[PDB]
Amino acid sequence: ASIKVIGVGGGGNNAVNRMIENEVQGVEYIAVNTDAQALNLSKAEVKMQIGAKLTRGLGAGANPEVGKKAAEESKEQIEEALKGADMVFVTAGMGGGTGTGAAPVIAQIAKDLGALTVGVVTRPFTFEGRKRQLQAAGGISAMKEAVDTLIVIPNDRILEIVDKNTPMLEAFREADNVLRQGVQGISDLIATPGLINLDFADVKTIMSNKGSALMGIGIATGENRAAEAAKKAISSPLLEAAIDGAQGVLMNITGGTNLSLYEVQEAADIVASASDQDVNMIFGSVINENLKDEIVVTVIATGFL
Numbered sequence: 001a002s003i004k005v006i007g008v009g010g011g012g013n014n015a016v017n018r019m020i021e022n023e024v025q026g027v028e029y030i031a032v033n034t035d036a037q038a039l040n041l042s043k044a045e046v047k048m049q050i051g052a053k054l055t056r057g058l059g060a061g062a063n064p065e066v067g068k069k070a071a072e073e074s075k076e077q078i079e080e081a082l083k084g085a086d087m088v089f090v091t092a093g094m095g096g097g098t099g100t101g102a103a104p105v106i107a108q109i110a111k112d113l114g115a116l117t118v119g120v121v122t123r124p125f126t127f128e129g130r131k132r133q134l135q136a137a138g139g140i141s142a143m144k145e146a147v148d149t150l151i152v153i154p155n156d157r158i159l160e161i162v163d164k165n166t167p168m169l170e171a172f173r174e175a176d177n178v179l180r181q182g183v184q185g186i187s188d189l190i191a192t193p194g195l196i197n198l199d200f201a202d203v204k205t206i207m208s209n210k211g212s213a214l215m216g217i218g219i220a221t222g223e224n225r226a227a228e229a230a231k232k233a234i235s236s237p238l239l240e241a242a243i244d245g246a247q248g249v250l251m252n253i254t255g256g257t258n259l260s261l262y263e264v265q266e267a268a269d270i271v272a273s274a275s276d277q278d279v280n281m282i283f284g285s286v287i288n289e290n291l292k293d294e295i296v297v298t299v300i301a302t303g304f305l
């Protein structure tokens with residue numbers, strides 16, 4: 001009922017902006033940064049500057065230690081901001097200083113408060129350099145110890161979706177959109193009750209912080225949309241392990257008012273047919289009025305180990 005989405009650092013805050021612009025509902029947004037300048041470009045209602053004393057508003061200069069200590073300096077404000085949350089999503093681009101360093105601290109505060117804590121983060125593009133990869137790896141494992149589930153999106157695979165024409169700025173806008181889809185694929189099923197009844201217990205069921213969780217997305221229009229989006233999702237480049245490896249699978253099929261009973265059934269059956277015979281699978285369905293002839297299928301795969 002109290003669902004919070006908390007973006008951390010530049011990348012995460014940009015993802016929270018795409019979410020606000022697509023009027024994702026049912027969630028309270030919070031933006032967190034060590035950089036005061038960037039913070040004021042956030043559209044989130046609550047804007048939290050962390051590590052005022054340590055960084056004086058100037059960012060964490062690409063050092064995860066500073067991001068971590070910034071979030072520790074602001075320990076009590078993060079607690080106040082999150083009090084009463086049943087569920088907390090923590091988004092960030094891993095690789096820099098504030099995301100990598102602060103996101104784990106914020107995730108741990110949320111778990112400690114009893115929130116169901118899901119992380120949704122990206123691993124950086126290979127073109128960003130070995131040092132960004134290293135820093136990111138470090139924060140990804142830190143995050144896994146601090147969340148109930150960590151969804152990890154490998155940015156390189158985004159380049160296998162958008163065309164090879166795409167320059168950096170547009171590539172990163174796509175990353176904001178994958179991050180949004182990872183949060184929203186889950187939050188939409190739980191923010192409001194759908195036509196398929198789907199509760200917290202159902203969602204707790206697919207939660208594992210043992211191994212990075214992975215997501216697949218598929219989008220289609222036209223008369224064969226259900227099967228095409230289901231099939232694309234199970235074949236998403238973002239889904240680096242095959243879906244049959246997963247012990248847990250959440251599936252979100254979203255569509256417009258013409259989303260049909262047979263499509264739901266078809267998409268659910270495709271995804272279940274690709275999955276392990278003993279998978280624990282929870283399916284949800286939501287109507288998005290703004291979609292017209294397009295459907296979206298998201299799968300979150302967990303418990304690969």
Ligand SMILES: Nc1nc2c(ncn2[C@@H]2O[C@H](COP(=O)(O)OP(=O)(O)OP(O)(O)=S)[C@@H](O)[C@H]2O)c(=O)[nH]1
Binds near residue numbers: 124
């Ligand atoms: N989704 C998204 N990801 C971004 C964007 N800009 C950079 N990234 C990714 O996130 C990673 C971290 O960058 P960023 O969020 O901007 O740093 P920061 O966490 O704020 O860290 P800092 O030291 O500058 S204070 C980058 O390595 C890159 O992969 C963006 O605008 N949107």
